[PDB]
A and B are shown apart, each in its own frame.
Chain A
C-alpha cells in the first residue's frame, strides 16, 4: 500500500465548516473514541496552522450500547476530485432492486488499515468541542482512510474486490454493491440460512483484518421485493356526496398533470347547482362512464419517465398523521421514479422529528439500492427544529442533503 494520489477539485479550498454544539454525553464518548483512535495511529493531533474543519458527532445505533463516531464529510465530499481514474462509477447493480433479501454491512472499519495521502490529511481536520468553551477544542486529522469520505470506498475499491473474489466466484447469483461505508448483499433463500451464509462473507474480513476485536456484528436486513408502490387510486362508493365529488374532481384535476387522458367534464356536471356539501348526489351513467376511463388510465405507468444519472434526485415527504408518511422520488416534476408510504415507525409515536428522521434514512437507503445515489430532500419542518434534533435520532453512516418546505402543500390529500 502506502500510495494514494488524491487531491482537491481545481479551484476549491478545503472545508471550513463550523462544529455545532454537542451534549456532554457525546463529547465524552468522542473523547474516549478519539483517544483510542490516536493510540492506534488512526488520527493525530494538529496545530493552529490547519484552518480546515469538518463537523463531528456521536451516533448510538440501537444495535449496540456503545457510541459511534460520525464525521459529516458532506462539504469535503463535494470538494474532492471525482474518482474516475479508478472507475467511472461501477455500473449500479440493477439486480439489487430485484432481490428479496438485501442486507447491509458496515465495512467501514476495513478502511482504517489503508493509509491516507500525507498532503491530503489536512483537509480531514475535525474538532471535538468543549462545553461552554472552557477549553480549546481538541483537534485531530485523519491518517488513514476516514469513515464517511467519498475517497475511502474509491481508494479501497482495489482491495475490496480482492477480499470478495473468492466469495463472488463461490456464488455468482449473489450481487455485491458498495456505497460509502456500507456493503449491500442480496440473496434469495431462507432467512435462517441467510444469516449463516452472510456470516460466511463476514468472516472474510476477519481473516483479512488480522493480518474486543473490531469487526461486524449486525446486519440491517431489507426486502426490496416487498416494498411499497403507490399508484393513484380513486374511491369506490355506492352513494357520493357533493363533498365527495369535489375531492374526487380535485384529485383527478391534480392527476391530469401526470396523466393526459384524465377528463373531469362529466363529473363536474354532477355539481350543477349550489347544493349542501353533505347532500348525496346520484351519479349519472355519463359521469360514471368518465370515472371508469380515468380509473383505467391510472392503472398504466407514467408516460415518458426515465432516470438520468446526471441530474439530482429529489425526495419530498408529507406528514399524514398517526405515524403515516408519504414520499415521492423524482427528478422532473410529475415524473415520479418511486412513491411510497410508511405506516409505523420505531417508537416515536409521540415524537414527530424522530419519525421524519428515520423516514429520511429509509428513503435514502432505498435510493442507494435503486440508483446508488442519495437524493436531495424537501422536509416538512422548520429549519431550526430539524437542525436542533435530527442528530439525536440519526443512525446511518452517510448524510444526505435537504431543504425545508415552509408552505403547506395542497397535494397532501391526493397522496393520502
Chain B
C-alpha cells in the first residue's frame, strides 16, 4: 500500500541573516548514551539523517529525564534558529469559544501525536537544523545530524503542521457535510448530528483516509470522553463550563497573590454572572515590585466575599442553536461596572461576561452602556457570526433624547428595554434657548498663577452678586467654582453666562460622574434644577456682566 506524499512547504531564513552556529554543551556519558540511542531510532524512522562535516551549522541538544520513567527524552534548543527563521502565518492564534460550538449528538477526539514528526521539512531548509551529539571524552568528532521532518520546537512547525493537516482533511470534509471536524495541536475533534452507529463508521473512514498519508491514530477506546479538559473549559456533551476554580483564602495577599486572583476571576466571568474584580485590580498601580506585600482594602474583601456566592454552586452554559434568536442582557453594577449574559432561552446562558469603564476624567452611564454594547457586539460576531438582540436597562425615550441631542454620532443595534434597576437615565438636560423669566447669572473666575490665590463669583440681572476668595486654586478651578456658586444661589430655572471654554467642554460632554469633586458638585446642582441654559461669550471683549464680573474676580 503506497503512501501519498505530503507536499513540502518552502521555508527561507530571514533576509540577510544566516543559520545558527551555537556550539554544543558538554553532556555526561549517560546523557550522551541516551541521545545516541534516541537518535539511532529516529534515524531508522527517517526523521533525521547523519550529515558530513560540510554542514557548518549547529543547534544545541540536551537530554532531560522523563518523569517516573527512567527513559531519557531528547530536546533541541531551536531558540537561536527561531530568531533567524522567517515569519509564518500563525493560524492557531484564536481558539473557539465553547458558547459558539453548535449542538452535536456525538463527539469523538482523535490523537494524531505521531503526525507532528511525520510531516516532511523543506529539502533546502534541513541543512539549518543540524545538531551535534558530543562524543565520550571529546576524543572523536560528534555525530552530526539534520532533521528531515518538522522538528519539535521549531518556529514554523505548528503552522506548517496545521496547514498540512488541513489539506489532508479537505476532501473528507467536502464529501461528508454531516461531519464537522476541528483541528488543534495533535487532536482532531469530530462531531456529527446523526446516530452513533453511523458515527463510528465515518470515524473509521477518517482513519483509513489518514492512513493514506502514513498517519495512524489509536483505535482502542480513547481515555478522553466528555467532558474534555481543553483550554481551561469542561466540554460535557450537552453543556460547558470553566474548569472549577477554588479561589483560595489568604491572610496576607501580595502582588503575585492578587495577580493570580485577577487572572483567575476574569476567566470565570465568562460563565459566572456578576463577577467583579475592579476593587481587587485597583490594588495594582505603579511599578511591578515582587517584594511588595501590599495591605488589602476593605472595599476589596466585601466584594471578594460577593464573588464566592457565585463561585460556590456550579453554573453551566449551553451550546449554540442557530435556529433560535441570540439575546444579550446588560446590568449596571456601579462604579463603572457592567455585567452581561448572552442566551437564547430563559434561565440557561450560553456565556456571561463583564465590561469595565475606560479610564477617563468625566463619563456617564449612557456612554458606558454604549461601549459595552459595541464590545458585546464585536465578541458575538466572533463567536456566533451575528449581532445579538439586546435587552437594555434604559427607556426607549431616554435613548432617543440622548442620541438626538448628543454632539457625537452614536448608535446601538436592535434592542428592547428591560425594567431591571438600576435604570440608566439622563440626570439633567440643558436648555436650547434662553429661559424667559429666569435670573441671568454672569459668572467668572480668575486665579493668580504665582500665589495660587484666586476669586470666583457672579453678577445677575436682579442685582444679586457674590465673590468668594479662594486659596490653592487655578484658572480652570475658579471658572468651575463660579458656575457652582451660580447654581447654588439661583432658583429652579436659571440662565448662566460664562466665558470658560474649559467649563463648556466639560458640560457639553454631559457627564454624570467625575474624578473632580468640583465637577461632581456642579452635577448635583444641575440635577436639582428645572431648567438650565448655559451660554458662552468670549472673554476680555468688554461684554457687560462678564466684563463687570471679570474685574471683580481679578481684583
Contact = CB atoms under 8 A, between A and B. Distances in A.
Nearest to A139: B89
A48 B159 contact: yes
Given A384-B371, A385-B374, A277 B533 contact: yes
Contacts of B434: 241, 243, 277-278
Interface in B53-95: 86-91, 94-95
Contacts of A253: 538, 541
A49 B88 contact: yes
Given A132-B384, A243-B535, A48 B374 contact: no
B544 interface: yes
Q: How large is the interface on A (under 10, 10 to 19, 20 to 34, 35 or more residues)?
A: 35 or more
Given A21-B382, A48-B9, A274-B460, A407 B505 contact: yes
A214 interface: no
Contact of A246 (B382, B407, B535): B535
Contacts of B505: 407-408, 410
A408 B508 contact: yes
B436 A134 contact: no
Given A246-B543, A271-B545, A276 B440 contact: yes
A384 B374 contact: yes
Contacts of A23: 381, 385-387
A47 B163 contact: yes
B410 A381 contact: yes
A161 interface: no
B495 A265 contact: no
A249 B537 contact: yes
Contacts of B408: 319, 380-382, 405, 408
A353 interface: yes
Most B-side CB within 10 Å, residue of A275, A276, A279, A352: A276
A50 B87 CA distance: 8
Contacts of B548: 273-274
Contacts of A274: 440, 442, 459-461, 544-545, 548
A351 B381 CA distance: 20
A35 to B, nearest CB: 12
A286 interface: no
Contacts, number: 187
A134 B162 contact: no
Contacts of B159: 48
A166 interface: no
B532 to A, nearest CB: 12
Most B-side CB within 10 Å, residue of A134, A405, A407: A134
B381 A21 contact: yes
Given A27-B385, A51-B88, A132-B100, A352 B94 contact: no
A384 B358 CA distance: 12
Most A-side CB within 10 Å, residue of B12, B162, B538: B538
Interface string A328-363: 000000000000000000000001111110000000
B234 to A, nearest CB: 18
B537 A132 contact: no
Interface in B407-459: 407-411, 433-436, 439-440, 442, 459
Contacts of A279: 461
Interface string A120-150: 0000010000011111110100000000000
Interface of A: 16, 21-24, 27, 47-51, 53, 125, 131-137, 139, 241-243, 246, 249-250, 253, 264-265, 268-269, 271-279, 319, 321-322, 351-356, 379-382, 384-385, 388-389, 405, 407-408, 410, 412
Given A132-B96, A352-B403, A408-B509, 9 more contacts: A16-B87, A48-B88, A48-B156, A131-B100, A134-B96, A134-B180, A352-B411, A385-B371, A410-B501
14 contacts: A48-B89, A48-B91, A48-B162, A49-B10, A49-B11, A132-B97, A132-B385, A136-B162, A136-B163, A265-B542, A274-B440, A277-B434, A278-B435, A385-B411
